[PDB]
Amino acid sequence: PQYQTWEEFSRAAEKLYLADPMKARVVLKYRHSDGNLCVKVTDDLVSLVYKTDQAQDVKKIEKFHSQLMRLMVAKE
Amino acid sequence: GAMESEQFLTELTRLFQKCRTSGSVYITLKKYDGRTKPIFEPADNKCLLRATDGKKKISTVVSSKEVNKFQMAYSNLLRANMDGLK
RNA sequence: GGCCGGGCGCGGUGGCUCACGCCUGUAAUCCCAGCACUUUGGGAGGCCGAGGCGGGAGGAUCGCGAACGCGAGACCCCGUCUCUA
Ligand SMILES: [Mg+2]
Ligand SMILES: [Mg+2]
Ligand SMILES: [Mg+2]
């Protein structure tokens, strides 16, 4: 579902990734014309979504996206 | 099409620019194990990125060996191009 | 025999492919404008698996009647049938 609280999404999204890294995907969608940004983490069993039009969330979403990328390339 | 991570960043910038007046920029990030056929030696230090406006597609693979430089440019790219929000 | 995508809206077609808008998949790209063709035409390159149907109270998402009740649904899952260089 959609999350209205960022930190709540962040925590659930990270949990979902860690549960099975290979099954997860992280998707960003940016619409300049509409002035909104969307981030999703899904493993095709659940879809965690955070949608925003607040500029402060861009840094939050970018760091989030960045952190998950670093985890993906860290060898077990 | 697939390309080196550095060219991906250049083409990603162009995609954002093309979709400034209209359209969505999609970016997908996943862990990548090096497979090239349906399901070798699986890779454990790589991810893939894809970007598209739904018509044009670009993709790359980023390894632990290039993640630092890639992150630096990529994070800067995202912050600079996603400037339409309030 | 195939896979290298799909859905909705809008335009279009007997219909498919298709343009635009929107929502999105793959480890799996770039193209042509065609087509006994309803599992929907073709080229380069790659690969061995792939698709139909039914169900999903898995699931973003897109819509409708309204000013609560519904529909469709990428991707995924289950059942089942069929095809193979
Ligand atoms: Mg598909
Ligand atoms: Mg075609
Ligand atoms: Mg359902």
Side-chain angles (χ1 to χ4, degrees), chain A residues 1-74, chain B residues 1-40 42-86:
Chain A
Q2 292 179 355
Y3 287 73
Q4 290 84 47
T5 301
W6 165 252
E7 191 72 0
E8 184 167 4
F9 163 85
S10 177
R11 292 167 181 163
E14 190 166 40
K15 177 186 172 170
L16 177 59
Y17 170 80
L18 293 166
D20 196 325
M22 286 301 294
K23 258 174 70 64
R25 65 171 177 277
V26 185
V27 186
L28 301 181
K29 179 184 69 180
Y30 176 70
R31 296 180 57 70
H32 178 83
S33 56
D34 288 348
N36 55 48
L37 173 61
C38 174
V39 59
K40 173 174 71 165
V41 188
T42 180
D43 66 349
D44 291 311
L45 303 173
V46 300
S47 290
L48 312 179
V49 183
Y50 182 85
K51 300 168 52 177
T52 181
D53 68 348
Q54 292 206 0
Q56 64 158 316
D57 286 348
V58 173
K59 192 187 180 175
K60 298 181 187 178
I61 289 170
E62 171 271 307
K63 286 190 288 180
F64 176 86
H65 200 255
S66 263
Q67 291 163 7
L68 293 199
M69 175 178 200
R70 297 195 71 88
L71 289 177
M72 288 169 180
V73 304
Chain B
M3 58 193 72
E4 307 276 31
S5 74
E6 317 83 32
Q7 198 191 157
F8 174 89
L9 297 168
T10 301
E11 289 307 310
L12 181 59
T13 294
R14 255 113 85 156
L15 201 65
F16 273 105
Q17 291 175 334
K18 172 187 167 194
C19 299
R20 210 166 158 75
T21 62
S22 176
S24 301
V25 179
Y26 291 94
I27 306 171
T28 300
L29 164 68
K30 305 181 65 174
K31 189 163 169 62
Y32 177 54
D33 68 357
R35 68 184 61 181
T36 60
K37 59 178 60 170
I39 294 178
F40 75 144
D44 197 29
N45 72 323
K46 298 185 182 191
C47 68
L48 65 84
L49 288 98
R50 310 193 198 88
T52 183
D53 63 354
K55 294 161 285 194
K56 208 260 178 293
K57 298 171 59 172
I58 59 177
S59 79
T60 194
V61 172
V62 178
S63 75
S64 66
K65 279 184 132 301
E66 55 232 30
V67 67
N68 285 329
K69 294 294 116 177
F70 185 84
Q71 258 208 311
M72 176 172 71
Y74 180 66
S75 56
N76 282 331
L77 188 150
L78 290 182
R79 271 185 268 107
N81 288 273
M82 298 196 296
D83 63 332
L85 278 58
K86 62 181 179 180

